[PDB]
Structures are given as C-alpha cells and as structure tokens.
Design a protein around this ligand. Structure first.
Ligand SMILES: COC(=O)[C@]1(Cc2ccc(O)c(CC=C(C)C)c2)OC(=O)C(O)=C1c1ccc(O)cc1
Ligand SMILES: COC(=O)[C@]1(Cc2ccc(O)c(CC=C(C)C)c2)OC(=O)C(O)=C1c1ccc(O)cc1
Lengths: 252, 262
C-alpha cells in the first residue's frame, strides 16, 4: 500500500521531466558554475536581444507574459498525467488549471532564481535582481516579491522528484471557486499529500517536518499571486502604451 | 501501433480542448434541431412579428439589428477560436507575428465550418440554440443583407452530408489554423511540421470513426477550397456595406482581421 505511493511519486517525476525542459537540477548546475549571457543593465539588455528573441520596462513585461503562456500549456500537459485528473468534470479541470497555473509558475520560477538573479530563455540568459528593481515604477517592484518568495522557498532544498508531487497537490485544490464536484478533487489531493509525505521522509530523512514547512509556503504563494493580480490592474488602469495588436491582446 | 497511439492521444487532447473552448457543440446543436426534445425546443423566427416576440422570448432597422448582432457574436467566436488555438501543441511556441497571421486568416474559415453544425436546409440556431432563424426570413432581408447568409447555408448542407462529429471537427479546425500557405508567414517549416502531425491525426480519426466512408479524408480537405471562397464573397459584401451604410459600425478586431486580407 506504500508501494502505490512510490509508483505515484515515480510516475509524477517521469511526467514532470517530460513536460518541463529546464529542471531544477539543470538550473542549479548553471546558477552555481556553457555559461549564460548576463543582463545587468540597459546596454547588456540591448545586446541581449541578439539571443533574447517600445519602452524597455513594457517590452520586458510583455516578453514575460508571452513566455508565461508557453508554460501554461506545459502545466496543462503535466496536469493530464495526474491519476484521476482527466476523469474529473471538464468544467472542474478548467477551473483547477485557471486558478492553479499562477501558483505553479511562481513555484517553478523559484527553481530558476537565486538571491542575485533569475535564469531566462531555458537557461540561455541570467537577468540580475538589481536590473529588475531598477525599472521605472510600477515595473521595478514586479519581480522583487517573487525573489523574496524564492529565497525562502529554495531554503527547503527540494529536488525535482519532490516538486513534481508538490505541483500536483497545488493543481488538486478543492477550494477553487466554482468547482461542481469537490469530493474526487479532495480524494486525489489526499492521495497526492500521502505520496508527498512519504517522498519527503525517504528523500530528506534529516529534514524534520519538511512536509509541514512546504504546505505552509502555500500561504506565501497565494499572497504573491493576489499581489501580482493587483499590480496587473495598476498596469491595465494607467498604462496607455500597453495596447498591443487586438489579436495579440486576445492570446493574453 | 506505438506511432498511431500518439495520434489517438493528440485527437483526445484536441477534442477535450474543443469541448472546453466551444459552449455550443454539433452534438447539442443536432439534439436541438432534430426536435426530439421537450426542454431544448427553440423559438422560431420566420417573420417580423415572430422576431418582435423573439425579443421577449430570447435572452433602428431590422436587417441592421440582425447584422450588428452577428458582428458581436463573431467577435465572441474569435475569442473561442483564439482560446482553442492556444491549446494546439506547438502553436504558442511559434513566432508572435505568425501566431497573429494564422488567426487573422484562419478564424473566418473556422466560423463558417462550425456555423454548419448549427444549420440545416431550413435555417440556423441563434442565441446558444434558444432560437432558430429560418433561411427564408434571412434571404427575404433588404438588399444587400438578403444574401449574406445564403452562401453559408449552401456550404452547410453539402458539408453536413460528410456527417462529421465534434471529435472529427476538433482535429479539422486545428488543420485549418496551422496553414503554412498564409500570406506573410515568416517561418513556414515549423507550421508545416505541426500541420503534418495534425493531418496524420485527422487521417487515423476519420478511418477509425468512419470505416465505411471512402476517401472522407480527401473529401474533407477539398472542402477547404469552399471555405476560402465563402470568405471572399463575405469580404466583397462588407466593402459594399461600408459605402452604402456609412452610419453602420464594423468592430475594430474584425476590421484588423479583414485589413489587407488577400
Ligand atoms: C517558470 O518559468 C517561466 O515561466 C519563465 C518564462 C520565461 C521564459 C523565458 C523568458 O525570457 C522570460 C522572461 C523573464 C523575465 C524576468 C523578463 C520568462 O521561464 C523562465 O526562465 C523565467 O525566468 C520565467 C518567468 C516566468 C514568470 C515571471 O514573472 C518571470 C520569469
Ligand atoms: C451561434 O449563432 C450564430 O452563429 C449566429 C449568431 C447569432 C447569435 C444570436 C443572435 O441573436 C443572432 C441574431 C441577432 C439578433 C439581434 C436577433 C445571431 O446565429 C445566426 O443566425 C447567425 O447567422 C450567426 C452568425 C452568423 C455569422 C457569423 O459570422 C457569426 C454568427
């Protein structure tokens, strides 16, 4: 019966590796020392465009949104590999992904961050924390709360096999508004929570109450998400130069 | 068999995303139209009085109010197709300008493909299938509004005879969006590679779902010629409206789609 939880752990690890090119293992190997191009100022950014692929702060934010949409499809694919997920009411699958992707993006973004900056373009670049802080308000305070979260999150020293199960727990949240059949969602999350618990005991025997400490980080995650939504409004309200091509507006 | 297993998974994925993106499926449309039902029975608009009463029953000039109404729903349909497109594996990975190009030229061919699901020889479901507007009433509309819908009906009765279900249409409308032959595409090869995979997916789906339908795949692909022609006539008809009805307002998103279209 513990054998089924190990099978679930391995299953989610295998699907996580398939769905996400840039693992934490890979990201960590880079961040510590195929060296990446560093963006530390406007001049290094300008030259960066030759491998990054009107105003600086707006172009960066927009680029980030384009790449965020690419990640949502990777997470959607991963979600369909979670035992029981596709058997749920189709409206509930949509609800769980709509509310879940933001929490997952910031969880996985921590894998790409240290206190000094963040890997960009599947590890091709490194944009410095200071450069992002240096953008004219309100763009200068967008990434900073994410860095704060990442520093505290990365102190848990989770690996990819741990994060694979954790991400599944996030997706199967029974408290998303508008859910029609909460029972099988909580029943799957119960099984994932059991699998995560055993994973963290076996993988981190020396790490006392790591399970508890990880679940507590959900608080921080949700604050980071609501804070981003609120700052997305300040943009929509007061930004004249944000108006993209009407058909691009639709995709985002 | 392992290769064909990945094509079944792609068809599954696309159908699943089709159900999520499109509130009114062919399956629901046909259940309303084939008049089996007591709860799903539509109110029928066939004349002015039934249109007037339809205003209370369903939730300026007549021909204009109907045309302004189709405009707004077309916009809402562009939204649904755009949401579907994002779900097609590889689409959001493509160049940003090419994503815009594929949608610009693709959405109207998809609108008319899926409008067929809502049509029989006698008329078309309106207001999410609550209403039904007769083909005769639409044809009797003041020139040039009288012949906007008739070419869609002509296409629909022929297309509908292929007897495709939603699981077929999900892969077909994906094949339409990933068209490498669109004017102004910067990188064609990555589009063609996605369409290759979609076409394999469609071919196995039509073979498994329609075993006794000879060359249904080839016959479906030929219908893409008919869609192309319906869009041209539609655009020509809009040019006439702009000049004849200067007081009538086209939607910017639709204007942007129509801007320098062939
Ligand atoms: C989970 O990770 C991600 O989704 C991202 C998306 C992404 C990919 C390539 C990129 O060049 C960017 C641009 C990142 C910035 C900070 C302008 C984002 O992949 C990243 O390497 C990265 O830094 C991401 C990212 C996502 C959301 C953000 O708010 C910031 C970065
Ligand atoms: C989903 O239903 C359709 O496809 C349309 C849109 C439609 C929806 C509700 C409506 O009330 C109407 C007609 C408008 C009034 C004010 C009675 C049209 O219903 C139609 O009869 C019709 O012709 C629709 C249509 C046609 C062409 C398009 O490009 C888009 C929608």
């Amino acid at each position: 019966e513990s054998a089924d939880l190990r099978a679930l752990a391995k299953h989610l690890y295998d699907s996580y590796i398939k769905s996400f090119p840039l693992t934490k293992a890979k990201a960590r190997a880079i961040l510590t020392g195929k060296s990446p191009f560093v963006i530390y100022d406007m001049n290094s950014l300008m030259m960066g465009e030759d491998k990054i692929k009107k105003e600086v702060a707006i172009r960066i934010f927009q680029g980030c949104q384009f790449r965020s949409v690419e990640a949502v499809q990777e997470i959607t694919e991963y979600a369909k590999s979670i035992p029981g997920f596709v058997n749920l009411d189709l409206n509930d699958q949509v609800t769980l992904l709509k509310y879940g992707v933001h929490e997952i993006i910031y969880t996985m973004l921590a894998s790409l961050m240290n206190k000094d900056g963040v890997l960009i373009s599947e590890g091709q670049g490194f944009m410095t924390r200071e450069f992002l802080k240096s953008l004219r308000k309100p763009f200068g305070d967008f990434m900073e709360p994410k860095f704060e979260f990442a520093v505290k999150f990365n102190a848990l020293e989770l690996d990819d096999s741990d994060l694979a199960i954790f991400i599944a727990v996030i997706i199967l949240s029974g408290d998303r508004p508008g859910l029609l059949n909460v029972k099988p969602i909580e029943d799957i999350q119960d099984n994932l929570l059991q699998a995560l618990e055993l994973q963290l005991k076996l993988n981190h025997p020396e790490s006392s109450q790591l399970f508890a400490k990880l679940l507590q980080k959900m608080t921080d995650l949700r604050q980071i998400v609501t804070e981003h939504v609120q700052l997305l409004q300040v943009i929509k309200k007061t930004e004249t130069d944000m108006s993209l091509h009407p058909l691009l507006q639709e995709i985002y």
